[PDB]
């Protein structure tokens with residue numbers, strides 16, 4: 128099983144071998160004395176980029192089958208009546224011919240469908256005819272038992288009910304992401320040319336590298352290794368000893384971005400302005416977040432937690448959620464915000480949201496952030512108006528438990544708590560954090576010292592003037608920072624800064 | 633429920649029966665429905681929930697439901713459960729907006745007798761009895777069980793001991809404290825379990841649980 | 850306590866406010882008072898827990914802690930009551946508006 132180039136997939140080969148090939152290995156005399164047919168179909172499903180094509184191809188080679196004939200879903204269709212399904216009929220011709228001629232001694236053929244869930248939807252247009260054709264041919268009046276057809280797909284739950292019956296697609300299999308052992312073995316297989324041919328240094332310990340890479344898909348490791356080797360060779364240009372060291376590996380590992388991993392760059396952009404503790408609250412909030420993170424990681428029964436942070440506009444709410452996330456160390460981190468969704472059609476919006484949620488269930492451990500609710504929901508007060516379907520998508524999503532032991536935390540923020548009361552959605556949420564704005568002068572002092580607005584004289588005088596002038600200061604941090612910059616790049620701090628602070632509060 | 637099961641299994645005329653479980657949110661209706669179902673041995677059992685009806689288009693929802701009903705008829709004995717009617721229809725109170733077609737289809741479906749003496753039982757659940765009155769759909773149901781909340785401390789003690797959370801002094805302390813801290817007590821079981829579990833981790837002593845139970849009622 | 854009573858006052862006022870701009874202002878002020886209420890709740894939570902821990906060996910300190918506890922519990926009860934009442938009232942208004950023939954079709 129492992130003598131060939133596939134790492135981490137152990138049980139699957141036992142299963143497939145026992146069901147598929149135990150009836151094609153022994154001499155025909157025994158099996159005909161047993162009088163059973165052969166399995167004529169195989170459906171293996173899972174997330175993309177995990178190695179489905181590879182295993183499918185290798186299966187043919189072990190049985191000494193004919194060369195595989197290959198097709199992908201959407202290319203089947205045409206626009207002339209009766210041409211879109213003729214192609215599905217072409218693929219079985221040669222098999223029919225050889226069966227009729229030779230008989231029971233023919234050589235096994237293999238067929239590969241790709242993206243089966245593009246065309247073969249539940250029936251009841253061209254689509255029904257396509258499905259009907261495939262049914263009528265895959266098992267018809269005439270016996271034809273020297274063939275095997277292989278199917279690869281991502282979503283098993285839309286294929287028509289009739290293809291999955293004992294007789295057409297008997298064996299259904301799942302391919303999941305590699306574990307640690309999988310990653311180590313993958314490295315072992317991949318670096319065989321480099322090992323035997325002696326262009327890999329002795330310092331690199333691939334076990335550490337496997338330990339360092341989480342949720343890597345099994346394809347991209349190839350990308351990593353080839354990039355590292357390219358890095359080393361390009362660095363050379365000398366033919367003394369072309370060795371690849373851990374340096375190149377570290378460089379390449381740093382460079383690549385996995386698909387099912389942290390999306391650091393957005394979250395970094397979110398908090399571009401810096402986190403300074405201008406008061407006592409910030410510490411408390413961050414502590415709360417850390418507590419909940421621990422609760423998620425350690426429990427067994429609390430596989431999901433819904434946490435809301437809410438407060439007045441401009442109070443700086445989203446950044447705290449970011450900071451909590453980036454200080455956690457979870458592998459899987461994605462962010463949904465209006466910026467992405469802008470310009471799309473409604474169907475596209477709902478599709479994106481659905482896919483994004485569906486992604487997380489596969490990984491062991493996940494945190495997922497939502498940027499704002501009223502904005503996504505198209506709220507506008509006059510009338511009022513909003514898109515309902517999106518609201519329902521979120522409402523149902525916020526109650527789904529992960530299908531299995533995998534774990535999820537979901538964080539979200541809003542400015543219109545009361546409005547959420549009024550729509551009657553609040554029952555989904557467990558715990559709430561409040562983020563009020565500044566109402567003090569010493570806070571303003573702390574922020575000016577952190578920003579280093581000016582020398583002490585200006586600072587003292589302005590705090591004095593605002594003390595004597597504004598008694599009930601109350602403004603968010605947004606206007607504070609932007610106003611401070613405006614005064615800095617402008618002239619005469621009292622002339623504007625004091626006035627603008629008064630006018631804003 | 634057991635009586636209903638027996639009655640449907642053996643009655644020449646009574647081919648179709650429809651029940652309705654209603655109660656306050658978090659009272660835990662779906663659990664009861666599932667338990668009734670599992671202990672019947674009816675060969676065909678299948679479930680509809682908003683969970684499965686996620687992210688499709690309206691027509692697809694109709695098609696799915698229609699297929700499921702159609703499938704049910706080709707078997708001698710059948711049971712179906714419908715989760716959170718008022719949510720299959722996407723009710724929201726400001727307007728109010730909701731989809732009409734799905735409501736009408738269910739209104740029809742719940743009354744159609746199966747063919748050839750085949751036998752069917754239907755359960756459905758809801759948490760918004762009032763709006764159901766208001767939409768004038770209640771004619772379809774032959775009977776209605778009611779599920780209230782828990783409302784006494786002894787029951788809560790029973791819950792602790794089934795959870796094995798309590799210690800012997802702990803139960804006395806918490807029970808007495810809440811006995812004087814809360815005259816009226818009424819919560820759903822779901823929230824109670826959540827609270828017991830979150831209290832089991834940090835600061836196990838009676839404190840955190842007492843004020844949490846307060847913060848529920 | 851003062852903040853809770855202000856929340857109750859805004860609840861009563863928002864039930865009667867018909868000018869859309871004023872209602873929006875009431876909603877935002879409500880958001881400010883709710884946020885302040887939650888923050889005070891969290892602060893008192895930690896400070897009272899620390900005071901009860903500090904009073905373990907002095908019956909007078911314990912007494913003080915327990916008094917704080919009682920008062921905070923009363924505060925919580927008041928909050929609960931207010932919330933429940935407001936929910937019940939929002940239900941009757943949401944009944945009022947739509948239980949009648951409606952403006953001409955969309």
Ligand SMILES: Nc1ncnc2c1ncn2[C@@H]1O[C@H](COP(=O)(O)OP(=O)(O)OP(=O)(O)O)[C@@H](O)[C@H]1O
Pocket residue numbers: 397398399400401402403404405409440441442443444445446447542604605608
């Ligand atoms: N203690 C702080 N907490 C949060 N943000 C802070 C803090 N101090 C300064 N900021 C600034 O606040 C901004 C981050 O908050 P963010 O822009 O997400 O605000 P917001 O309230 O989500 O905004 P919006 O008004 O769009 O709803 C950055 O400019 C950051 O530097």
Ligand SMILES: Nc1ncnc2c1ncn2[C@@H]1O[C@H](COP(=O)(O)OP(=O)(O)OP(=O)(O)O)[C@@H](O)[C@H]1O
Pocket residue numbers: 656657658659660661662663664716759821822825
């Ligand atoms: N005897 C019991 N009755 C009800 N629930 C129980 C019981 N024992 C344990 N439970 C737990 O409490 C849960 C009850 O809540 P459930 O999940 O049924 O929600 P619900 O109130 O029906 O739903 P909704 O939130 O839609 O109103 C059960 O799922 C189970 O986890």
Ligand SMILES: Nc1ncnc2c1ncn2[C@@H]1O[C@H](COP(=O)(O)OP(=O)(O)O)[C@@H](O)[C@H]1O
Pocket residue numbers: 132133134135175176177178179180181313344345346347349
């Ligand atoms: N478990 C694995 N074992 C060996 N190679 C793998 C594995 N997973 C991915 N690969 C590598 O990635 C590629 C597999 O392609 P695949 O993941 O099936 O992409 P697609 O699904 O788009 O065909 C090959 O280069 C293969 O060697």
